[PDB]
């Protein structure tokens, strides 16, 4: 790729962790040199703590700054809770309904059996439940899932596949429950 | 653990590249374009409901630059160890012939935050309609990145996401086809 000069990286992260709305908030400030976190400020601790010997100088120096410490201690409110409220409407409250399709897998390692794929895509937030039914009875064994795949554009997708030996007359159902809908979405495939 | 908002920034030498962004539960809210000194919202509508003063990012990045120099010295000039990316290509929805879709090239678990990505269609580079995100933070302190290519599915087209990174000895091509 060219230019093999050694590289030097410095990262700073201010993580605001929220539990039950803004009831419990934890602020975690961290410094990372290359791939090593050296020092951090954890609101539950209340002061800087070196994570490695390299960050010792900073934890001691910053902690000696009582004004900085107090600012950092009040941040759970002035920073975290404040920013949470700022975008609550298009983040915490964002809802996009999943598009659900079902199709038999074009790839079948061995005839007789089969694989039904339930594709659930374009949804937000991540919380979702996808279930497979056979003639209305829930299928629990034979089901595998990709889990949540974040698309990077505020949308998720997942694939939930049912291994089955379909018999004419059977009715297969993929059912999806997600915060964006009040009743489950269902798509059926008739063998 | 219900929600997490992160303000992540970085500065890299000798490239002299810095980045400033906010993310919510892993998705980018916005970042600051350093050359235009402006806030860039991941989804256009976010900007219609909130604002951020970009100059503040500029001031933090200057401090990050200065701090990188300090740590570079303190570590006796220990450089970063390259970690090559994992690359996967998928569509954002099931593909149906002659129905518009989008190829997603997911570049994950790499560092430093410098990469070259190119979409190929039948071996030739394509640029029309493509987009990408900035470098997104990971809990292990590596990075993730997404590149996108809107396309019209066809039975003959073969696509590649070509990725180059210092941790790789050669270009890594991840293929996709209907």
């Amino acid at each position: 790729m060219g230019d093999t000069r050694p590289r030097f990286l410095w990262q700073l992260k201010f993580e605001c962790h929220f539990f039950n709305g803004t009831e419990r908030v934890r602020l975690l400030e961290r410094c990372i040199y290359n791939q090593e976190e050296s020092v951090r400020f954890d609101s539950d601790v209340g002061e800087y703590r070196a994570v490695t010997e390299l960050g010792r100088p900073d934890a001691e120096y910053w902690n000696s700054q009582k004004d900085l410490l107090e600012q950092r201690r009040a941040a759970v409110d002035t920073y975290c809770r404040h920013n949470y409220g700022v975008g609550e409407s298009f983040t915490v409250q964002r809802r996009v309904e999943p598009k659900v399709t079902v199709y038999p897998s074009k790839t079948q390692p061995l005839q007789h059996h089969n694989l039904l794929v339930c594709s659930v895509s374009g949804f937000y937030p991540g919380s979702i439940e996808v279930r497979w039914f056979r003639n209305g009875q829930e299928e629990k064994a034979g089901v595998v899932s990709t889990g949540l795949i974040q698309n990077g554009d505020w949308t998720f997708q997942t694939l939930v596949m049912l291994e089955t030996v379909p018999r004419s007359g059977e009715v297969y159902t993929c059912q999806v429950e997600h915060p964006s809908v009040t009743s489950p979405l269902t798509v059926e495939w008739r063998a | 653990e219900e929600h997490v908002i992160i303000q992540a920034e970085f500065y890299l030498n000798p490239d002299q590249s810095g980045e400033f962004m906010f993310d919510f539960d892993g998705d980018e809210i916005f970042h600051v374009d350093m050359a235009k000194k402006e806030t860039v919202w991941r989804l256009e509508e976010f900007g219609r409901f909130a604002s951020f003063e970009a100059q503040g990012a500029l001031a933090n990045i200057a401090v990050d630059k200065a701090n990188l120099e300090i740590m570079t010295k303190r570590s006796n000039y220990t450089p970063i160890t390259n970690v090559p990316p994992e690359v996967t290509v998928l569509t954002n929805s099931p593909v149906e012939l002659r129905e518009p879709n989008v190829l997603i090239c997911f570049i994950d678990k790499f560092t430093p935050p410098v990469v070259n990505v190119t979409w190929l269609r039948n071996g030739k580079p394509v640029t029309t309609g493509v987009s990408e995100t900035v470098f997104l933070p990971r809990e292990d302190h590596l990075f993730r990145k997404f590149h996108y290519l809107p396309f019209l599915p066809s039975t003959e087209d073969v696509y590649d996401c070509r990725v180059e990174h210092w941790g790789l000895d050669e270009p890594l091509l991840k293929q996709w086809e209907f």
Binding site: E29, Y79, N83, V86 | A50, S51, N60, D64, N67, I70
Partner: peptide, 13 residues
């Protein structure tokens, strides 16, 4: 509604 950022702190020197 405006996002507020935490300021970067200069390291010990």
């Amino acid at each position: 509604p405006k996002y507020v950022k935490q300021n970067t702190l200069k390291l010990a020197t």
